[PDB]
């Protein structure tokens, strides 16, 4: 089946994800940064 270490990969990914959700818990959105990100993403995907 899958490589034996895929379980630890899933665990590491879940750890990092939940750390990022924790960071988002006390984060505040920025409109201008969002607009810059959206423009960059539109440029990257060839739109």
């Amino acid at each position: 089946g899958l490589p034996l270490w895929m379980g630890t990969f899933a665990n590491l990914m879940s750890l990092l994800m939940c750390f990022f959700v924790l960071l988002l818990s006390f984060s505040e959105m920025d409109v201008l940064k969002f607009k810059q990100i959206a423009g960059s993403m539109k440029f990257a995907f060839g739109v």
Binding site: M29, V31, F34, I37, A38, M41, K42, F45, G46, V47
Partner: protein, 211 residues
């Protein structure tokens, strides 16, 4: 949630890959055998054993039993009828194994199509980013693809393959039992000894738990 597009994506991708694996006629045959294994019940071994006992005492609804009786009635020898019954049993075994393979292939290919669909949806939402409040719910519908694949890989296709394998085992048991019954009938054995030999099959590889 409910999304026609996501279920269409998963079903279409799985169908394309399976049609690359099998043919359309084989797929329809697999569906037919799955239906016959679902909405119909296999004959219980006890009823078949009682039928063999009654025919032995006197000397038919099962098609295999009817075929065996007809092959006996026209003055045939043991080896030819044995070969014919072995051929029929092998044909049934092959059909059931092929249906199991078809539904197993569907089950393994559903989640990959789910992931492909959700990745495509995520790419679309990233290339069409307009409103921050809509960055959250968008992936919702995207993830709807993966969920569907998961469900189809675990509630539909793999359970159908397991049911097909179960029906394969049950039919093989019944047809082997009918083989021993027809060999006993052509051998002219006592009803009691063959009856005991037949109930010897009632503790087979899956009916021992109910004992």
């Amino acid at each position: 949630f409910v999304d026609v597009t996501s279920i269409l994506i998963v079903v279409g991708g799985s169908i394309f890959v399976v049609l690359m694996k099998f043919t359309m006629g084989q797929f329809f045959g697999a569906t037919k055998i799955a239906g016959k294994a679902f909405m119909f019940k296999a004959d219980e071994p006890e009823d078949l054993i009682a039928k063999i006992v009654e025919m032995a005492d006197a000397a038919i609804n099962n098609t295999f039993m009817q075929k065996g009786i007809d092959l006996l009635v026209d003055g045939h020898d043991a080896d030819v009828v044995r070969a014919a019954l072995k051929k029929d049993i092998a044909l049934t075994d092959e059909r059931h194994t092929q249906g199991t393979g078809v539904f197993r292939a569907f089950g393994d290919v559903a989640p990959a199509m789910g992931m492909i669909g959700t990745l495509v949806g995520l790419v679309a939402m990233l290339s069409n980013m307009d409103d921050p409040k809509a960055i959250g719910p968008a992936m919702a519908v995207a993830l709807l693809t993966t969920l569907y694949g998961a469900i189809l890989s675990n509630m539909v296709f793999f359970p159908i393959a397991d049911k097909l394998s179960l029906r394969r085992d049950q039919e093989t048991l019944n047809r082997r039992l009918i083989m021993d019954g027809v060999l006993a009938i052509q051998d002219g054995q006592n009803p009691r000894v063959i009856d005991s030999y037949l109930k010897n099959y009632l503790n087979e590889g899956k009916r021992a738990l109910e004992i």
